[PDB]
Amino acid sequence: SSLAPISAKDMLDYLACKDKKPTDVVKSHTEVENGKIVRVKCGDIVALVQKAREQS
Amino acid sequence: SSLAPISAKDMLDYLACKDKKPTDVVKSHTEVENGKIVRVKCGDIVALVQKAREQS
Amino acid sequence: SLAPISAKDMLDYLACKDKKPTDVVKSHTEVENGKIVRVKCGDIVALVQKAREQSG
Amino acid sequence: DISTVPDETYDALKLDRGKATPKETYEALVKRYKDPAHGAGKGTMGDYWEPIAISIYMDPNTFYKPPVSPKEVAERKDCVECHSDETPVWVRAWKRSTHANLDKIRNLKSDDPLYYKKGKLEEVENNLRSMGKLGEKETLKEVGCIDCHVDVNKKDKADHTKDIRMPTADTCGTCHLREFAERESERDTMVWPNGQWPAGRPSHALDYTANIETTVWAAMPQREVAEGCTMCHTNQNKCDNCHTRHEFSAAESRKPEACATCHSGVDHNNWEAYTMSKHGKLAEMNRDKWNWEVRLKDAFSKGGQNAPTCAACHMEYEGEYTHNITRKTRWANYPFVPGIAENITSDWSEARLDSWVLTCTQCHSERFARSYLDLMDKGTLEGLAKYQEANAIVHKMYEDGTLTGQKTNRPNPPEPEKPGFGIFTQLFWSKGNNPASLELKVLEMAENNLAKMHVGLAHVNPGGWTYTEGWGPMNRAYVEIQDEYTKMQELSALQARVNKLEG
Amino acid sequence: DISTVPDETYDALKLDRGKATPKETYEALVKRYKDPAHGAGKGTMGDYWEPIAISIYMDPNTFYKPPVSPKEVAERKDCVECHSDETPVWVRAWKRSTHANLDKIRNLKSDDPLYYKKGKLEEVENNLRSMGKLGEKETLKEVGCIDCHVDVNKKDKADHTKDIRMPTADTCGTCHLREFAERESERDTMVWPNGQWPAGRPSHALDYTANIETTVWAAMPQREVAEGCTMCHTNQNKCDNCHTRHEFSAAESRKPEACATCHSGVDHNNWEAYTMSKHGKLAEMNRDKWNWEVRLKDAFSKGGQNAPTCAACHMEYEGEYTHNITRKTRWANYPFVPGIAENITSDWSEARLDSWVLTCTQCHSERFARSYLDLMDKGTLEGLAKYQEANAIVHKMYEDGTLTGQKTNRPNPPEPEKPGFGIFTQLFWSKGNNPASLELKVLEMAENNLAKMHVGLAHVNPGGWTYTEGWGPMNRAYVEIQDEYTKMQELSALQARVNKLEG
Amino acid sequence: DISTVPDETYDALKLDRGKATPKETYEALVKRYKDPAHGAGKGTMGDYWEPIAISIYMDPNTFYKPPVSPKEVAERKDCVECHSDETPVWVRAWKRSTHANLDKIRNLKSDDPLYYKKGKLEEVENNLRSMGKLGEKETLKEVGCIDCHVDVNKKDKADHTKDIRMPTADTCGTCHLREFAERESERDTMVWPNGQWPAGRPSHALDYTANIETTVWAAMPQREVAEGCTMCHTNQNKCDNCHTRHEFSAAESRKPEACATCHSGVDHNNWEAYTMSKHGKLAEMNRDKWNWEVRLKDAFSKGGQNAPTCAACHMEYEGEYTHNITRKTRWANYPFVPGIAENITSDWSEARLDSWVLTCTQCHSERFARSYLDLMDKGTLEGLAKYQEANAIVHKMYEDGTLTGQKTNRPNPPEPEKPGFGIFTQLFWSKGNNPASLELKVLEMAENNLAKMHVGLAHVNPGGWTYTEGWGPMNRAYVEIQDEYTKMQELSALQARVNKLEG
């Protein structure tokens, strides 16, 4: 079947969190807000990816 | 003398109507109307070209 | 810090080197009223020398 | 059996590898190759377009017929004699070709690096003997004009007005069954797990099918313009696009310049990116020190090649070089295709990623190779996200109907294309405000700039995804999309106050 | 008599082919060459521009004078010795040149493919004796610095402050009268039936005249910018633009790279289109297998050339290779020129079309050659119609005065240029809203994109008229012209309602 | 003493030229090279960016650590054996290199043009003896993997997980102290009189420092995009960007193609401008006639080179060729930099102009050389003035706050960048209407078009500053800036009348 859509900003935050603990926080590779790079908790992005994979 | 001006769409419809009967219908090479390629009757394009040949 | 000089003035200065102050040359960039602007060498050289004294 | 043909090809042809003979395997390939259900013919939209004069050479199996003049009959030698003054270079190029000097291959000693051509010469004869084209002990003397253009190893008369044909891929496959099966294997190896692309695509085996199955290619009236696309999509029909006629030099096809005519442009600048890379510039500086005549398997050892080429990087798979160039594809040049980015972390892509590392570890280290390939994947996603943010702005206007002339002057595309937002048809057809400036700008932002960004990342040209191509133009597209969107919002707010004063 | 010079050249010079001596023919060529009425001098707009430092080398017959330093007198041998360290490569390049080794040509046997240079050596000596440059028993020793830069076959001292000259075309024509007459024949062969271009243009014989007769070239104040155009238009003045100084290699001029510096750019990308074609990429892969020293007549047989080059396609006419490159021009690169498209079906174009087919049939067949040339003609007309529809929109606004800033901020172009719509001056001069964005965009749509489309069609680069160049950008220009036109229409309708509320 | 190192280098290092030994000079160079105060390390903004996988190869002295696998210890011969199958081409390229065949340099006779390499081999050994790297009677056997990647002239075992290093510039300088000192001299020779650029910049010695000290390079989140900039700024860290690994061919670095990957693009098209010039096209036609193996000093005499290359023009200074390419810089590619134009007439610039004429006089005359260099300077100012007029229009709108979305949707740049008008950060970062279209268009008008204009002037490509690049695009940018300014003024005037009707 067709794979569930995932935005490229989410793919990068997912790729940046590989081999890292879910509580680790990394900088987004594309998002910038209030003059700073948006920080992404690794537990949230992996959860956002897995919730889309289960819909496939 | 100077040659009479002929639009490129008329040049293409004339070349598509060469060695063709005046009643034949060919496809335009550039025009599209109402979501379909415009059909040009060969009698009309040759008449428009011949009226330009006599003005040269 | 060096004093700022517009590029049109640099060109008019190069065209007035080894020339009399009363000589008039054509600008290399300016066009007004459908003609190239003529620049008197006495004015452009004076504008450069007043900028040289503000340099270090 | 052909050891360079994957299992998926025999499985799709209902053949057993052990018992399949060169004649039996060839017949099964031609059946699917010439089947209109598998892409042959004028395609599904053949009722909307008609061929032109040059089209008989682009798709010979569908449109070609021999010329009415001259009305002469000729033997094998009569082709060389009459055409020695009708096509003088064609005869002189054929004379130097290996096809006319087969005894020059048999007398090559075992120490000369070109001894591998003798094994293929015997294999070529091996494929013909199974088909009953020559005796089991009779040797192939030459490959003349009558062989390719009429019938392989013909000994009798041929009519120039009835029997002349354009040598298509199957004509080349009669003798070169190995290379023809490897290219046709692309229909079976290039299968996407989530259906991102049609099965067997993108590939040289279905480039003509993809070309004629493009809606805008059949719908647009400018047939001479659309046939220009066909000239880059003729690998399916003929096999002289890398080793050209009539020299048919294998050393020529290995050079990077053979891929330049097709794999270059605003939507896939592989030639521009590779040449400007260190890999390509080294190929331009050291092409006089390399032996291009040796095969790709021996190019790094017996050829003295120290920089990678298009044939070396793309035709290699797990240490073997075949005419299948799809077994390592992951991104397929267009990152915006749905499912391509989401599949880059799958085991399907990771297996092909390891296959690419195996190609680079022939020179670099595995740590260095994977260090840059990770940059290619993440760098491509960084560009993809830049387009997705700009596309959300233009797509919002499309659903809101606020695009320029969207509701006033937006004529329908030529049949059989349906009107849409940011469709490929708008790249080669335009009328009125269809497409709009914002609609075309964001379309090209992905179709052209984002693609050239990934190409620059895949072919190590730093400027190819930073300043010159990719991130540079995408930044400009993002800025101008934001600028026009804010401008049109201000214009809408200004027009809203005018409607208030009139109501 | 020179058998490679057409009848129109002798007829225009009032000379009889049989009785005309090399001395009489040379004087008649120089008379027209240096006549200000035939393009020599500063041109009709010479009162608007003044030369710069580099202009003495671009137009030597008008501006060059010997330098005041040094004040030394020199013989023939003193030229080589002192310049061996003042201009070391010029001396070292000239020694390597054939001009310094003329006895090396006499020992060439008849079996050597370069024996034709001996016949030209004797022809050069034969022309010099007709002019009274040496005794009938004296042999030409060498072609030294004093020969080209002072006087041919000078035997006494020369003053470096009085006798030094830049060797112009007539200076080269003193010895090479054949090639000089062939180039000068372009004034007489290139005559358009309906006056689409000035007589003798476009041609290498009047490229400098065309440059100085361009209004913007004389009107613009940026002389250093305009003189850059001159650097591509110096074939009329000097003859070292293909076989450069001081090697003057005939093998160099036959290579495609010799035409690249001039025939390349946004309005005529012949170098980009040819190289990216299969013909050009084949020339890049096989340039080590070809004998560039052999002449073009033997290049396809005795030179081993299997792909066409710039010199092979354009200098050939009815089987003979001459320095006249105008006898096969039909489109002249710019399809939007009035009368060019309507003349493509005339007997004048059809005769030159048959002359092009004769060039193609040296390799391809006549059916294949005419099949693509028909694509080039129709494809150019298909692109031309795309511009004509977009030009009608912008020209519609110009006559209506609705262009941006047309009535508020549109200053006149620099004298002696008259204000107009979409003029060539607006490409190199701009002030205020003169030109406008739409006006410049549609101007570039024809001057740049439409021109590059035909170039891609004429030089078989499929991407050159589809995705990358030609139809690609023309499609975008059509979209952006339609988008801005609809926007300005909506802006005008909104402004009309404001005037309604104020009335 | 190194005779090719300027006095300013020894003076800046507090050393006396005469008595300083190679060991003493090397330690002083490495001290400043690895000093974070002189550009080493992560830079002043190191807390804003983190390295990626490829960064351990881009800046090894800051990020590189040996790989955890394999965990084996190896001698010299074990490097060649195991890597003969792990990186087979790396071994085969090193075997062909001069580093593996040092006895081939000692047996070179005096008649061989490559005899100068023996003097460098003896000088390399002389530098190592001062540093205690080999016996006073021991000859350098080879330059193996363990020498560059572990320690120079190592005789015992080495741990693959602890002692493996990436050969940085100082690693190359242990043996090649001359070329390492010449490159590091750029920190001291490139000093601008009014501080137009930072001291020692632009130069290959501080290209990585300039890269990491760029605000947008550290602020932007797209590390894979920003690291593409790093790949062109690695000359400071490693020395294999011209003579690549692992052949390290001096003939390769002399070719123009070695500089193409970095000196090419939208802001500095030096490769595009040179190649399309007559100088470059001659280098493509005559690269088979030149002996690239001879040094640059002997390239014009013993190499037969008649056309200039990148290394010949830029590494030359007063007749000597060194790795310092800054002692003749005048324009520094970017004419819009404050103080650059005003400094072009100073004695500092005029002295370097005279140094360029000495480079040009190798072929041309001083009159011809100064004639075109006068065109380059005046032509560069003519383009600069065109941008200055257009920048005044956009800068007026910025100060007036009338830019699109300047006060409504203009988010701040990523830290530590402060918001501004026409800043370099807006080329690689954009969000909302920051930057605006006019703001980015005038920025690119100078950063890209004006820069490529001067490059075309400096590298004699006539189309590079007229039609295609430079004046062409600058004209379009000027037109479109003028058009949008008139449109927004009319839109502002129309909006003012709406507020009048509402008041």
Ligand code: HEC
């Ligand atoms: C049987 C009559 C053949 C036909 C049909 C085709 N080829 Fe062939 N070719 C044949 C042999 C026995 C050989 C020599 C052995 C070998 O495999 O090399 C060749 C040669 C070639 C080559 C090699 C070029 C070189 O540098 O040695 C190429 C690249 C080639 N041929 C291409 C080719 C193409 C494209 C064909 C279809 C049009 C084709 N060949 C048909 C035998 C026969």
Ligand code: HEC
């Ligand atoms: C008489 C003093 C001459 C002048 C003036 C010029 N040329 Fe010459 N050239 C001359 C001779 C006797 C020859 C040898 C015979 C021949 O083949 O022409 C040449 C040679 C050339 C060549 C070919 C060199 C090669 O290696 O093939 C070229 C391309 C050439 N000449 C060009 C040329 C130009 C551009 C001149 C004006 C600067 C010029 N020639 C003047 C004799 C004389």
Ligand code: HEC
């Ligand atoms: C580019 C269009 C050129 C211009 C301008 C000039 N020449 Fe030329 N020349 C050119 C080519 C491509 C060739 C090769 C012709 C062939 O058949 O291979 C030549 C040849 C010559 C020669 C012949 C020398 C030889 O073949 O040995 C001569 C003597 C020559 N050219 C001289 C010459 C002169 C006098 C010119 C100014 C009128 C001139 N050339 C201009 C390309 C071009």
Ligand code: HEC
């Ligand atoms: C054969 C494939 C050619 C090669 C090789 C080159 N050119 Fe060409 N050229 C060719 C054709 C069929 C045409 C158009 C014919 C027509 O009907 O107009 C052209 C056109 C040009 C022109 C304009 C002159 C003309 O005859 O139309 C120029 C100035 C031109 N081409 C330049 C050019 C250059 C620089 C080449 C080497 C890179 C070159 N041509 C090669 C055919 C062929």
Ligand code: HEC
């Ligand atoms: C001592 C073990 C060395 C180290 C460390 C480096 N190089 Fe070297 N190299 C060395 C010698 C004795 C020679 C002989 C030739 C010479 O000119 O000295 C070389 C050779 C080169 C060359 C020229 C090769 C050629 O074929 O001309 C180059 C361009 C070169 N070396 C570059 C280079 C670089 C980039 C280094 C750091 C990675 C480096 N060398 C280190 C000895 C030694």
Ligand code: ISW
């Ligand atoms: C003209 C309108 C053209 C048509 C109808 C056409 N091409 Fe092409 N082309 C490539 C990508 C495609 C695809 C996509 C993949 C698929 O559907 O199978 C289609 C249908 C198509 N073209 C038909 C690629 C792939 C790039 C990559 O790196 O993966 C090519 C390589 C390619 C050659 C090509 C050329 C040659 C220069 C031209 C002018 C066109 N195409 C035009 C276009």
Ligand code: ISW
């Ligand atoms: C700068 C402003 C320039 C001027 C004044 C100029 N050129 Fe050019 N050029 C070609 C076409 C022309 C013509 C047209 C034909 C005619 O009227 O006689 C003129 C007046 C002209 N230029 C003067 C062509 C033809 C293209 C083709 O394929 O037929 C060239 C080839 C050509 C060289 C050239 C260059 C070199 C790169 C440059 C920078 C310019 N021209 C600029 C331009």
Ligand code: ISW
């Ligand atoms: C990406 C955002 C990039 C950064 C951070 C960067 N480069 Fe570069 N580059 C050149 C000019 C500069 C400068 C200017 C002078 C200085 O401050 O020292 C900086 C800080 C810089 N780059 C860092 C030049 C100069 C051109 C000339 O002729 O003088 C180069 C050559 C150069 C290589 C380069 C590349 C390689 C292709 C890329 C992709 C970038 N830079 C991106 C850019």
Ligand SMILES: O=C1C=CC(=O)c2c(O)cccc21
């Ligand atoms: O060229 C194409 C790239 C992506 C794509 O989706 C596509 C398509 O859907 C139809 C025709 C061409 C293309």
Ligand SMILES: O=C1C=CC(=O)c2c(O)cccc21
């Ligand atoms: O370069 C030119 C192309 C077309 C044209 O019409 C023209 C022109 O009319 C005057 C100067 C140059 C040109």
